Design a protein around this ligand. Structure first.
Ligand code: NI
Length: 341
């Protein structure tokens, strides 16, 4: 049964609620982004209207084979009427095609559902600026002050400089980047661009990337592994065993691997500056864990909410424990008292 925090009161609408069977009273199912915990349950046999972004709709059609007649893509930043209710989709600064949804209820209540997001001050000048929000359904993934990480731009700078140094010292080094879903494409695209290479990958991953409307993509990616010195592999293969095995396959073209694991936050964030990050090394293989996040830090989350001033907050992440819930409610009250709403 569908939980309360996936239902939008006063509507026929649910958000990211595909794993519950037919939800009683739901006339339209919204999907915020193409990540598995959110799309869980969709397939080619789904027969209810799905509302999402163009990019999310490309992935639904090509990867999950959802039939075209049930896919309803909406443009961003545009007032649209769905089953008699005004909605707007906003960029969520998460993975490609990820959105926030603004719902303008018939009784005058305004609701913002963030989906998954990385809050940014640029959101303070979207169509959110123009009106009041009564209820906020919030991505609270990192809602605790120990969760700090750098900007995405500093992390990319670290990775570009790292890769460029290694390969200029040894032109026979291979770079490998881990992946297990969409998002974080800047990591491997920025590295390949500094090295003057395309990024090589499996047919299944190339297909996924072809759905993302990324400009000039045919210039950046390829299925010909032999022609590329930046390879993508499944995240589970980013370990000494998996990389040794991969090095075997390259036919003595390479004699060293430098590999990157983009993670979210890890406890080495509580001690180490991005500048000071070092790899784990075994022989001719090194592995860097880099803190490339597509969710708000605690400070970024706080700034957004204190700007928005919602009347009520409903968390969508970390909802399963009482300790989590009590922690989050404490921070929301702090934020409200400090800012004065
Ligand atoms: Ni996500």
């Amino acid at each position: 049964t569908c939980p309360f925090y996936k239902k939008i009161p006063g509507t026929g609408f649910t958000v990211d609620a595909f794993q519950y069977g037919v939800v009683e009273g739901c006339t339209a199912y919204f999907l915020t982004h193409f990540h598995s915990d959110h799309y869980a349950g969709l397939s080619k046999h789904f027969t209810f209207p799905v509302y999402c972004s163009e990019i999310t709709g490309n992935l639904l059609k090509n990867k999950l084979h959802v039939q075209e007649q049930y896919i309803h893509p909406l443009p961003l930043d545009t007032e649209c009427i769905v089953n008699g209710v005004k909605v707007v989709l906003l960029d969520a600064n998460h993975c490609p095609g990820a959105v926030m949804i603004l719902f303008y209820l018939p009784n005058g209540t305004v609701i913002l559902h963030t989906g998954d997001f990385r809050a940014d001050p640029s959101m303070e000048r979207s169509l959110l600026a123009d009106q009041k929000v009564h209820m906020l359904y919030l991505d609270t993934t990192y809602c605790s002050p120990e969760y700090t990480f750098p900007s995405q731009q500093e992390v990319i700078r670290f990775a570009i400089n790292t890769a460029f140094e290694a390969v200029t010292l040894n032109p026979h080094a291979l770079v490998v980047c881990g992946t297990y879903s969409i998002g974080k494409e800047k990591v491997f695209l920025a590295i390949a661009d500094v090295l003057g290479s395309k990024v090589g990958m499996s047919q299944e991953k190339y297909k996924t990337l072809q759905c993302l409307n990324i400009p000039e993509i045919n210039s950046l990616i390829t299925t010909d592994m032999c022609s590329s010195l930046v390879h993508l592999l499944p995240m589970m293969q980013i370990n000494f065993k998996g990389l040794q095995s991969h090095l075997k396959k390259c036919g003595g073209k390479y004699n060293q691997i430098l590999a990157f694991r983009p993670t979210g936050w890890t406890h080495s964030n509580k001690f180490t500056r991005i500048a000071d990050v070092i790899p784990q090394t075994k022989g001719n293989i090194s592995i860097y864990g880099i803190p490339y996040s597509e969710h708000s830090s605690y400070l970024e989350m706080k700034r957004f909410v204190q700007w928005l001033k919602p009347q009520k907050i409903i968390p969508t992440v970390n909802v399963g424990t009482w300790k989590s819930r009590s922690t989050m409610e404490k921070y929301f009250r702090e934020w409200k008292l400090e800012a004065g709403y």
